[PDB]
Amino acid sequence: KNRAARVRVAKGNKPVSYEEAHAPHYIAHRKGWLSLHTGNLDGEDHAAERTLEDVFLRKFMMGTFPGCLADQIVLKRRANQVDICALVLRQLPAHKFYFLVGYSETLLSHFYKCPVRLHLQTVPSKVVYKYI
Amino acid sequence: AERPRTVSRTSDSDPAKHGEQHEGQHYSIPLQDLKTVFPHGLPPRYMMQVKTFGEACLMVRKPALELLGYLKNTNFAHPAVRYLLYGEKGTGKTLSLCHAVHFCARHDWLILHIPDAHLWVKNCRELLQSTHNKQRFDQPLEASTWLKNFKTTNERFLSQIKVQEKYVWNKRESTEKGSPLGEVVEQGLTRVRNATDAVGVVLKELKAQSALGLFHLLVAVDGVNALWGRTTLKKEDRTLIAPEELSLVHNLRKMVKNDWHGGAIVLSLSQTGSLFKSRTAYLPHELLGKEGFNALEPFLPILIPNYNPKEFESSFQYYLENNWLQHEKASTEEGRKELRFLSNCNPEQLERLCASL
Amino acid sequence: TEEDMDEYVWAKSSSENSVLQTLLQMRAAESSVAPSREELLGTKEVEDYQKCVVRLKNEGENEASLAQYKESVKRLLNLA
Amino acid sequence: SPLSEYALRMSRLSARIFGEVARSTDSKSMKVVSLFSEQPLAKKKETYDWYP
Amino acid sequence: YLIYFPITQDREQLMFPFHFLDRLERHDVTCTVSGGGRSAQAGAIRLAM
Amino acid sequence: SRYAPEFREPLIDKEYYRKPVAELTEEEKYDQELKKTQFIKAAAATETSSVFADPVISKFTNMMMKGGNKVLARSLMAQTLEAVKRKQFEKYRAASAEEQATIERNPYRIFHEALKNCEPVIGLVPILKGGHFYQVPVPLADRRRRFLAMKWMITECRENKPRRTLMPEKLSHELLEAFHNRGPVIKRKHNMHKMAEANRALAHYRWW
Amino acid sequence: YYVDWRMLRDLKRRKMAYEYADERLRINSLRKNTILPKDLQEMAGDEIAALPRDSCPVRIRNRCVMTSRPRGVKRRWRLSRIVFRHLADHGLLSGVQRAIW
Ligand SMILES: Nc1ncnc2c1ncn2[C@@H]1O[C@H](COP(=O)(O)OP(=O)(O)OP(=O)(O)O)[C@@H](O)[C@H]1O
C-alpha cells in the first residue's frame, strides 16, 4: 500500500483541507504547485539552490508564526523578487502581525540578498474541504 | 494473346543480321558459341536460365543495337574507342556487353574478355610478390582461371600469333622469339607461379601485334570501375593494398587506354560486387571516381534503361513460351499488370519475381 | 594541384591531355604532318567537348548531361 | 587522401587566423589545451558550494 | 519505388490500393515519407495513397 | 489489443466487392449493409489483393521466421519454390512424352498436395476419466491437423539435414518426396496413426 | 552543525580541492603531454603526489545536502531519492509531477 502524502481515512471526524485531501498523483491534475520558480524548466540552472531556499523559507515561517498558519505557504519568485503568500489564522492581535511582517521581511532580505515581501490573507478558521 | 510471342523469337542466329526491326526479339545463341565465346562472362542467374530452359536466348535491344552499329563502322586506323555501358542495377549491362562480344567473335575478332574485374580486388587467398617488380603482387589463382577461359575462346588464334620477344619464365625455362602465343599460355597453366606473368605477356603481345593488321582485338572488360577504386586485400603488415600495386590490375589499365589501334574497347560499369560504393550508385563519375573518369575520357556512355512496353511484353511471353510462369493467374491480364508493377520493368527483378512463381 | 581546385578547369588538365593525345593520334593516322597543339584544341569539336566535360564536373552529372556529352564525343571522334 | 602542400599551408593559415593549434600535436599533448581552456572541476560553483 | 523499396513486400503494400480498384498504370503518385523503418514507411504511404 | 471489440476483420477479396448486387446471397448482402455502420480493422502489411498471394504459403513462411526476420523467411520460401520448379523442369525435359504428361511443374500445387498428404487425421489426446488421465484416440480438428503437417515439415528440414545443405535444398527435396507419399514426414504421420491404433480400446472414453 | 561527521569530512575535501585547483592544474599539465623531457615529467609526477591527499578532487562524494546519504542522490537537486520524493509528493517542487503515460 502507498503511504506517501496520503491523509488516511478515520471515522469521518478528521477535517482535511483541499491540499491534504489529494494524494500525490493529483499534482498537476486537481491541485497545483506550492512553489513557482523557473529552476526546473528545461535548460535552466540553480534548481538545487531554489529548492534549498524553499525548505528553509517554510521552516522559518512556521516558527515565526507559530500556530497561526491555516495552510501551507505559497512561494512565488519573479526576477530576483521573492513573494510569500500565507493563509494565517486570526489568533494574534493585528499590531503583532505588522511587527512579524516587518521583521520577517527585513531578516530574509538580508539573508538571501533579494527583495522579499510577505502577503498575508487572514482566515477566521481553517477551511475544511471534506471530513474523512 | 500471343501476339508478342511471335515477337518473342527471331531466326537470325547471326548477330550481324540484327537491326531495329528485330528489337524486342530473343535470338538463340548457338550451342557451340556458348561453349566457346561464353565460357565466362554470362551472369550467374542467367546461366541458371540457360541450364533449365536448355537454350540461351538474348533479347535484341536498342542499347545493344547502337553499340553493334559503332563496332561495324570501326575505323581501325584511328585509335581504339572506349564504349562505356552505364545503367542501374539489373538493367542488362552485362548481357548488352555479351551481345557485343558475340558480334565480334563471329567476325573472327580476338576476344579479350574479362568477365568480372571485381574478383581481382577482393577475397584473394593467395597473394604472392612479383619478380618483375617487387612492389607489385601476383594473384596466381585469379590469373590461372582467366587464362583457361581466354584459351578456350581464342584457341584458333593461339597458333597464328607468335611472340616478338624472348621471355625467361625461370632459369631453366624461357620462350624463344617466334614461338606460337599458345606456348606462353601453356606455360602459365602448367606453372601457376608464372600464371600472373603469362597474362601480362599475353596482354602486351596482343596490344603490340594488333596494330600490325594481323587480327582485330576486342578488349571487353565488365566491371571496369574496380580498376581505379579501392581493394579489400591486405599486405603482410595488415595494411590494405591499392589497385595499382596488384599485377593483374596494372596490366589491364594499359589495355583500356586509347594509345593503340586495331580494335575497340567495350567497358561496363557494375555497382554489384563493387567495394565501398553505395547501393544506389550507377552513374559513371560516382562509380569510376575522379581517377577512373579521367583515365577513360573521352569515352562514349551508352545508357542501358529498363524494359520498354514492347520489350516487357516480349520477355513476358518468352517466360510463358517455356512454361516458366506456372502459376494459374500469371497468364492473366491482372497477373501481367501486377508483375509489371512489382518488377517495375526491371529485367533482373522480373526474372526474380517470375522465378518463384 | 588539380585535386585542390573546387571548380573544374579543363585548361591544363588530364582531360586536355587525353583529348590532345587522341587528336594527335587521329591526325597521324590520317597521314597528315604532325600538327600544332593550338590548332588541334582550337577546333569547334574541341570547344563543345570542353563545355560538356565542364558541365559534368561542375554543373552535375545526370543522364541528361551525359547525353549531351555523348554527342560531343561522337563529333570529336568522328563516329557515326 | 593525403594533404598536398596547398592544403596543409592553407590549414595553417586558417588555424593562425582562428587561434587554433597550428603545429602537428599528438592527442596526448592536446590535453594541455583542454586543461587550460576549461574550468577545473574543483573551481566550479556546484562543487565548492555543494552544501548549504 | 523500386530503388527506394528494394524489398518486394514493401512494394506489394504500395500495390494494394491500386490493384484493388483495378487502377494500375492510370495514376502518377509523388510521396514524401519521413520516419520509421522500411515496413512502417510502406504502410504509411499505402494509407496516404 | 488496440482494436475495440466492435471492430471487424477486413475483407480483401477484390471480386467480392465488384460482383453484381443480385449475385450476392442475401446473407452476404446483409453483412455489407451492416458493415457500412461498423468499424473496420486496418489490413495487415502482408494482406493484399494480389492474385499471387496464397494464405497457406504465407502461413508456412511465418512458421519459419525467426526473430521477426520476414525478409529471410520469405526469401527461403521463394528459393524453395524455385528449387522445386527447377527440379521438375529438369525431370520433364529428360523424360519421354508419356512420362512428361504425369510430371507436375507447378510448385504451388506440389506444396499444397504435399502438406495435405502429411496431415494426420486422428491423434492421441489426454482425456480425464475418473479423475485420471488416459491417452484416448481423438479426431483431430482442422486447424490442429493443418498445423501438425507444417510443423513436422519445418522440423525435419531444420534438424535432420547435413551441415552444409541449405533449407531451400532440404525443403524442396522434402516437399517433393511428400508429394509422392514416401518421406520421413509421412512416416511421422504413420506413427501417430499407428499409436492410436494400439490405444483404440480407450476410444469410447470420449464424451463428444 | 552539519548532518554527520561524514558530511563534515566531505566539506573539507571540497574546500581543500578549491585551494589546490590551480596548483594541481599547472603541475599536472606538465605531465599530460609528450613535448617536455621525461626527466621533468618524472619529477612533476612526484610534486603532484606530494600535495595533500584531500587536495585530490576524486575523493569528493556527492551526498544529499539534507541527509548526507552517499548514494541515491539526484545531482540536479542534491537530494537523495527519499528526500526528493517527500518534497515532490507534497507539491513543493516547482514543476515536478508524477509520470503517467
Ligand atoms: N538482353 C537481355 N536478354 C535477356 N535477359 C536479359 C537481357 N538483359 C537483361 N536480362 C535479364 O536481366 C538479368 C540481369 O542482367 P545483367 O546481369 O546483364 O544486368 P546488369 O545491369 O549487368 O546487372 P548488375 O548491375 O547486377 O551487374 C538477366 O539475368 C536476365 O534475366
Ligand SMILES: [Mg+2]
Ligand atoms: Mg553486370
Ligand SMILES: [Mg+2]
Ligand atoms: Mg547523526
Ligand SMILES: [Mg+2]
Ligand atoms: Mg566518486
